[PDB]
Amino acid sequence: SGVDDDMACHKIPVDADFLYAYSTAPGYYSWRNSKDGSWFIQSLCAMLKQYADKLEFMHILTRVNRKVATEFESFSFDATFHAKKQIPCIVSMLTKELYFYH
Amino acid sequence: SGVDDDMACHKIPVDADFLYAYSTAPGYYSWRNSKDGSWFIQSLCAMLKQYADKLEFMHILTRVNRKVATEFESFSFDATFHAKKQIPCIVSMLTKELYFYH
Amino acid sequence: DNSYKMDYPEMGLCIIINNKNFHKSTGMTSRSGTDVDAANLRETFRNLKYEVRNKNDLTREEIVELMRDVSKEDHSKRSSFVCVLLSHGEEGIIFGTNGPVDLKKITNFFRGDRCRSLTGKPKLFIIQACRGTELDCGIE
Amino acid sequence: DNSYKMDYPEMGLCIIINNKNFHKSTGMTSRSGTDVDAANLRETFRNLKYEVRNKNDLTREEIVELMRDVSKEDHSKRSSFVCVLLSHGEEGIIFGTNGPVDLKKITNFFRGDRCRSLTGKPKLFIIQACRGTELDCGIE
Numbered sequence: 001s002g003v004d005d006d007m008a009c010h011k012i013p014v015d016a017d018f019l020y021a022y023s024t025a026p027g028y029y030s031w032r033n034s035k036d037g038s039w040f041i042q043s044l045c046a047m048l049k050q051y052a053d054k055l056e057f058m059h060i061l062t063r064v065n066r067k068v069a070t071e072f073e074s075f076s077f078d079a080t081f082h083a084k085k086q087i088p089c090i091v092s093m094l095t096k097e098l099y100f101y102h
Numbered sequence: 103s104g105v106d107d108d109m110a111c112h113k114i115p116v117d118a119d120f121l122y123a124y125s126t127a128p129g130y131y132s133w134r135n136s137k138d139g140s141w142f143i144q145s146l147c148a149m150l151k152q153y154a155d156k157l158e159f160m161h162i163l164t165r166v167n168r169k170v171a172t173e174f175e176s177f178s179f180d181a182t183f184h185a186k187k188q189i190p191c192i193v194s195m196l197t198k199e200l201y202f203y204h
Numbered sequence: 205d206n207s208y209k210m211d212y213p214e215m216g217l218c219i220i221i222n223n224k225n226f227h228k229s230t231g232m233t234s235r236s237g238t239d240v241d242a243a244n245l246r247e248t249f250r251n252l253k254y255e256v257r258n259k260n261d262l263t264r265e266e267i268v269e270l271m272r273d274v275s276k277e278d279h280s281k282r283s284s285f286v287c288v289l290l291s292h293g294e295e296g297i298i299f300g301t302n303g304p305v306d307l308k309k310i311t312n313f314f315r316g317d318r319c320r321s322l323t324g325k326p327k328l329f330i331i332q333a334c335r336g337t338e339l340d341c342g343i344e
Numbered sequence: 345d346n347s348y349k350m351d352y353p354e355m356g357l358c359i360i361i362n363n364k365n366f367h368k369s370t371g372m373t374s375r376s377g378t379d380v381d382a383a384n385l386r387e388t389f390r391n392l393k394y395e396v397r398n399k400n401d402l403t404r405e406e407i408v409e410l411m412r413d414v415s416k417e418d419h420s421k422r423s424s425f426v427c428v429l430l431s432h433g434e435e436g437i438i439f440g441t442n443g444p445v446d447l448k449k450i451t452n453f454f455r456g457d458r459c460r461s462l463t464g465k466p467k468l469f470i471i472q473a474c475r476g477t478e479l480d481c482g483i484e
């Protein structure tokens with residue numbers, strides 16, 4: 001406080017109000033079914049359909065995280081790429097809650 | 103679906119259920135007042151005090167984002183480091199909502 | 205104001221870059237199933253009242269010019285902005301059909317000081333792409 | 345289950361690494377005001393019913409051994425885990441008093457497969473440190 005607050009003229013950071021919804025954790029592969037689409041986009045769309053009229057966006061995205069993490073696993077004849085998992089990654093520099101039904 | 107879901111044996115990702123509350127955006131400086139502490143920790147503690155019995159953790163952290171972004175600005179005799187701003191960065195790989203009052 | 209104002213005349217743009225097919229010179233294999241994702245997204249964001257614009261198989265250069273042009277529109281009557289990137293990727297990088305682009309180049313156009321008609325408004329980047337080559341074997 | 349179970353006998357540990365003073369060889373200046381942060385955090389997390397453990401001026405090696413030992417405790421009766429890092433930093437890096445440590449080394453101890461008594465439980469890393477040398481001049 002003192003020198004660093006109660007500014008006469010208000011500014012906001014240039015990176016404020018961005019949200020990144022990443023399909024996977026930093027450094028990791030992300031997975032896609034050739035017929036049904038990617039795990040992440042499938043789950044994102046299904047959770048938006050079910051909850052966009054009911055939940056705040058971060059809470060919708062937390063259910064996407066759980067759906068991808070818990071329900072999906074890779075399948076491959078190559079053992080290297082078989083039985084692999086994925087956790088999506090929410091990066092929020094938002095400053096307020098986001099409700100689509102608003 | 104089909105090959106990649108309704109697993110007989112359930113697994114979760116090894117990076118699931120982590121949350122990173124970063125003081126600042128990727129690539130950026132983070133700021134600290136020599137007498138009052140860092141902007142981020144000051145704001146984090148104040149928002150936990152006010153809302154930990156009322157809001158889910160991501161919503162508490164979204165108010166920390168707004169408090170840091172809107173209320174704080176650097177002050178320095180060196181023009182290079184003066185009038186600078188900061189947006190904290192929430193990185194959530196959580197799979198559920200977190201309520202401290204639970 | 206704990207919530208973003210979402211009652212502007214328009215919810216805003218939803219730009220979907222759907223990259224399925226990649227130049228031989230990159231050695232990147234076709235992204236089968238991405239069209240299913242693109243169609244799901246179009247329908248989902250249409251029901252949220254977004255103005256959806258789908259683009260297919262864009263070069264790194266076309267991605268950059270598209271996002272530049274979109275950032276230079278007047279977004280004054282829009283509540284928000286959404287961009288969905290569907291492609292190959294690595295950490296901090298999305299692939300055009302002909303090679304890598306730095307995500308920062310894309311997102312910087314929309315910074316608070318560079319897209320003034322979106323200042324104060326939520327800018328959402330939804331990214332289906334790899335972020336490296338680590339493998340999660342899971343637990344349990 | 346939309347919410348983490350938070351009615352285990354203990355809320356869990358809150359580990360605070362408070363690095364104020366750095367070896368001459370690093371050229372890192374003293375972090376005045378960090379003790380105010382450490383005290384605020386101790387009180388705040390005490391009121392949330394966390395078991396708070398404060399540590400001051402740890403070498404890179406002491407940080408690594410501390411987090412290893414903490415990850416090897418039996419967390420079965422705890423709802424969650426919190427670690428707060430207060431130091432100099434750069435992207436992906438936190439400084440011990442005598443030099444940089446990769447954050448990944450710290451966090452990997454708590455992975456779902458490596459700390460089984462915290463599998464399924466929220467692991468929170470709260471980081472006050474720089475993440476590079478970019479400068480936000482803001483807008484408005």
Ligand SMILES: *CC(=O)[C@H](CC(=O)O)NC(=O)[C@@H]1C=C2CCCC[C@@H]2n2c(=O)n(C[C@H](CCC(=O)O)NC(=O)Cc3ccccc3)c(=O)n21
Binds near residue numbers: 032035105106291294
């Ligand atoms: C790395 C990336 O940027 C892409 C992102 C994307 O295309 O959306 N990720 C992949 O390509 C992912 C990772 C790998 C590892 C390296 C080899 C390429 C491989 N790969 C891949 O072949 N697919 C598609 C296949 C589809 C086969 C099918 O549907 O039968 N999926 C798999 O190999 C594993 C799999 C995943 C989910 C369901 C079934 C199988 C990828 O998505 N990737």
Ligand SMILES: *CC(=O)[C@H](CC(=O)O)NC(=O)[C@@H]1C=C2CCCC[C@@H]2n2c(=O)n(C[C@H](CCC(=O)O)NC(=O)Cc3ccccc3)c(=O)n21
Binds near residue numbers: 131177
């Ligand atoms: C880069 C880091 O890892 C640290 C993180 C931390 O210590 O919490 N960040 C800084 O050190 C930040 C950045 C810089 C840029 C390079 C020179 C060092 C500088 N710096 C710094 O000197 N402080 C402390 C001073 C305190 C002076 C005071 O209270 O009068 N703050 C400032 O220089 C600017 C300032 C910020 C808030 C309020 C008043 C002034 C930093 O925090 N940093």
